Write a protein that binds this ligand. Structure first.
Ligand SMILES: NC(=O)[C@H]1CCCN(C(=O)Nc2cccc3c2SCCC3)C1
Ligand SMILES: [Zn+2]
Length: 139
């Protein structure tokens, strides 16, 4: 679990969105596993606007942060799960690192701010949904 809180927005994994997220929906994209909802409070985070390929992410299944080298946002095949049919997920970045199903929502950050959130994983890999191209989150 986890979310990004920026301005009057809450960014979460679309497959983990609550009834309240859907009732206050701003934007969602099943191909990116992202959903953004509106909030009444201002929130704590800032978004990176950069091309970093190294950063640090929070891994809830180890209660620890780990440094990672990650690929550029791209279209990657993701096997069927209880949440989605087999499909290509877009704007996804892979890295070698530990992750388990409940780790989705963990934040990836570089020196410039929040880069994205944990969205996929398995066998010593961890996939992050990029948020750096969503320029409207800052206004
Ligand atoms: N973005 C998606 O389509 C996700 C939706 C939730 C289920 N999917 C996962 O990749 N879950 C997951 C996360 C982290 C680690 C492991 C897993 S499943 C296998 C064991 C490792 C696909
Ligand atoms: Zn950066």
């Amino acid at each position: 679990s986890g979310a990004i809180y920026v301005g009057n927005y809450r960014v979460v994994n679309r497959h983990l969105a609550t009834h309240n997220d859907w009732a206050n929906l701003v934007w969602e994209d099943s191909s990116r596993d992202l959903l953004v909802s509106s909030t009444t409070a201002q929130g704590c985070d800032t978004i990176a606007r950069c091309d970093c390929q190294t950063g640090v992410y929070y891994c809830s299944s180890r209660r620890k942060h780990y440094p990672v080298s990650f690929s550029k946002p791209s279209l990657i095949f993701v096997e069927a799960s209880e949440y989605y049919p087999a499909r290509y997920q877009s704007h996804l970045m892979l890295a070698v690192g530990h992750s388990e199903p409940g780790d989705c929502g963990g934040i990836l950050r570089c020196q410039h701010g929040v880069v994205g959130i944990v969205s996929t994983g398995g066998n010593g890999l961890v996939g992050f949904a990029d948020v750096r191209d969503l320029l409207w989150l800052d206004e």
